[PDB]
Write an enzyme that holds these catalytic residues in place. Structure first.
Site, mmCIF file in Angstrom:
data_model
loop_
_atom_site.group_PDB
_atom_site.id
_atom_site.type_symbol
_atom_site.label_atom_id
_atom_site.label_comp_id
_atom_site.label_asym_id
_atom_site.label_seq_id
_atom_site.Cartn_x
_atom_site.Cartn_y
_atom_site.Cartn_z
ATOM 1 N N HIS A 94 7.323 -9.231 -6.339
ATOM 2 C CA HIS A 94 6.651 -9.433 -4.895
ATOM 3 C C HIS A 94 5.676 -8.338 -5.029
ATOM 4 C CE1 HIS A 94 10.134 -6.878 -3.450
ATOM 5 N NE2 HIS A 94 9.280 -6.557 -3.068
ATOM 6 N N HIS A 120 2.673 1.425 -3.982
ATOM 7 C CA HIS A 120 2.412 -0.151 -3.566
ATOM 8 C C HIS A 120 1.148 -0.771 -2.929
ATOM 9 C CE1 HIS A 120 4.652 -1.148 -0.534
ATOM 10 N NE2 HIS A 120 4.438 -1.915 -0.160
ATOM 11 N N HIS A 173 -0.724 -3.932 -2.214
ATOM 12 C CA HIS A 173 -1.024 -5.704 -1.833
ATOM 13 C C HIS A 173 -2.277 -6.170 -1.806
ATOM 14 C CE1 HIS A 173 2.616 -5.761 0.105
ATOM 15 N NE2 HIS A 173 2.487 -4.683 0.662
ATOM 16 N N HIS A 181 -0.333 1.005 -0.236
ATOM 17 C CA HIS A 181 0.249 1.557 0.702
ATOM 18 C C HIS A 181 1.315 3.078 0.436
ATOM 19 C CE1 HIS A 181 0.618 -2.240 3.185
ATOM 20 N NE2 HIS A 181 -0.368 -1.444 3.736
ATOM 21 N N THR A 209 7.485 -6.589 4.596
ATOM 22 C CA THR A 209 8.023 -7.401 3.670
ATOM 23 C C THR A 209 9.628 -7.167 4.166
ATOM 24 O OG1 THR A 209 9.335 -5.956 1.268
ATOM 25 C CG2 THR A 209 7.136 -7.411 1.948
HETATM 26 ZN ZN LIG Z 1 2.632 -2.886 2.347
#
Ligand SMILES: [Zn+2]
Length: 255
Positions: A60, A90, A92, A115, A195
């Protein structure tokens, strides 16, 4: 769960009912409504002693893991109480430059969102932290397309190696200070994980000031795969969650 038409964010509530809770993230930051709070202390980012270990493709996104067995890379000050240790970072991103951020500013969407996750040392580990309302602190940074980000190239160059789900690669001596904007001015509110299990244990800190990345930088992110090695190829794009209802909560500004 994923980000497709059949297992996408609009579907998560079935297995993770907190999806429709009272302190879900991300949200839209209405800068005209955000309240300037003079009792907000400046942020304290101590990352000079940070120790990266590896990078991995979890299906993801990709994560850069850090050694959090000691107070090497910490976050404190601001609206936080106690010390928060950096565990991982990570991003997005979207399929185009027009979308990708999770948080939005006056409804404006950025190309991507960074993040930095930290956990409160009071609770001993990450697993215990995620069971508390003040358990985590996420540092969010917006990415816009412009000039290259000298500090991000190391990450960029290793993606070839973790193209598919399950892959991981040694990733030591990575200095996160290279991803920080000039100003530490921020917005903060109480929210959740982006998530599943979407636990409502985060103190969000969204930096006002975006960092710029080059088109070719972001492009390499778009080459990742959701899928495992040997399965049909599904590009890892649009791994961002739609803005949620503020529901009473208030967004404070340090400026
Ligand atoms: Zn995030």
């Amino acid at each position: 769960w994923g980000y497709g038409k059949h297992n996408g964010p609009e579907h998560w509530h079935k297995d993770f009912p907190i999806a429709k809770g009272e302190r879900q993230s991300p949200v839209d930051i209405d800068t005209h409504t955000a309240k300037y709070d003079p009792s907000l202390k400046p942020l304290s980012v101590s990352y000079d002693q940070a120790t990266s270990l590896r990078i991995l493709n979890n299906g993801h996104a990709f994560n850069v893991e850090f050694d959090d067995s000691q107070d090497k890379a910490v976050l404190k000050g601001g609206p936080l109480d106690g010390t928060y240790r950096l565990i991982q970072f990570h991003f997005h991103w979207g399929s185009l430059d027009g979308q990708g951020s999770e948080h939005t500013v006056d409804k404006k969407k950025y190309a991507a969102e960074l993040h930095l996750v930290h956990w409160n040392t009071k609770y001993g580990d990450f697993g215990k932290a995620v069971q508390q309302p003040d358990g985590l602190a996420v540092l969010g940074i917006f990415l816009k397309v412009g000039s290259a980000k000298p500090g991000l190239q190391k990450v960029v160059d290793v993606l070839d190696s973790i193209k598919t789900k399950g892959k991981s690669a040694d990733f030591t001596n990575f200095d996160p200070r290279g991803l920080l904007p000039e100003s530490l001015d921020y917005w903060t509110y109480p929210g959740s994980l982006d998530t599943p299990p979407l636990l409502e244990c985060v103190t969000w800190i969204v930096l006002k000031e975006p960092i710029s990345v080059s088109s070719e930088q972001v492009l390499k992110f778009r080459k990742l795969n959701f899928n495992g090695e040997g399965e049909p190829e599904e590009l890892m794009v649009d791994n961002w969650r739609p803005a949620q209802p503020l529901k009473n909560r208030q967004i404070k500004a340090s400026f």
